[PDB]
Amino acid sequence: MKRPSVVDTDFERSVKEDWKYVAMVIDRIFLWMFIIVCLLGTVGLFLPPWL
């Protein structure tokens, strides 16, 4: 992810936009973990029985 390299002047808005980007980053961390777990867990639960 490449945060758009845009510069701000107002400090309060600038920070409130940094917080808004930390929230996005945290979501993407788990979006991968849950995607991986859902694919890994479901395969590791139903595949062995099918064999």
Binding site: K20, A23, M24, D27, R28, L31, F34, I35, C38, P49
Partner: protein, 165 residues
């Protein structure tokens, strides 16, 4: 107690109908793809082997006039002759045990339970892709949780309450 067919050489043929409710342990590990093995144990109650002895008329259970149920199919239905002693009495009592191996047809429960469950589960990870400004992240994940909670109770009303598996 239907009539019996009596021949002139002493042979007697008796084929009464019956409706039996026999207890069989059910494993639901691979439900709705499970394969049940329910047995019936038949034997003379009072007469032991020295007095009444059973003979396997034919190992396979007759199925020519079997009524296709549409939900189960009998993979194998064979009777086994066994003899074993009981603490009641000193003699050997025989018995014939019929094992009905019935395989479930999974189309119905796949469409009504499995597929609806998958569709709800597909939405588990969508919440993380929503933008926090939408103000609907909680509605999405809460709805999924309750939806799955109900689906776990519907299954709880079908499968037996066995703790083995």
């Amino acid at each position: 107690l239907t009539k019996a067919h009596l021949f002139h050489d002493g042979r007697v043929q008796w084929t009464p109908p019956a409706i039996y409710k026999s207890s069989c342990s059910i494993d639901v590990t691979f439900f709705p793809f499970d394969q049940q093995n329910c047995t019936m144990k038949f034997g003379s109650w009072t007469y032991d082997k020295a007095k009444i002895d059973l003979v396997n008329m034919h190992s396979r259970v007759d199925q020519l006039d079997f009524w296709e149920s549409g939900e189960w199919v009998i993979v194998d239905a064979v009777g086994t002759y066994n003899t074993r002693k009981y603490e009641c009495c000193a003699e050997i009592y025989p018995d014939i045990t019929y094992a009905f191996v019935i395989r479930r047809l999974p189309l119905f429960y796949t469409i009504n339970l499995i597929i609806p469950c998958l569709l709800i589960s597909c939405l588990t990870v969508l919440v993380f892709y929503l933008p926090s400004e939408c103000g609907e992240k909680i509605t999405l994940c809460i709805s999924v949780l309750l939806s799955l909670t109900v689906f776990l109770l519907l299954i709880t009303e079908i499968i037996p309450s066995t703790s083995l598996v």
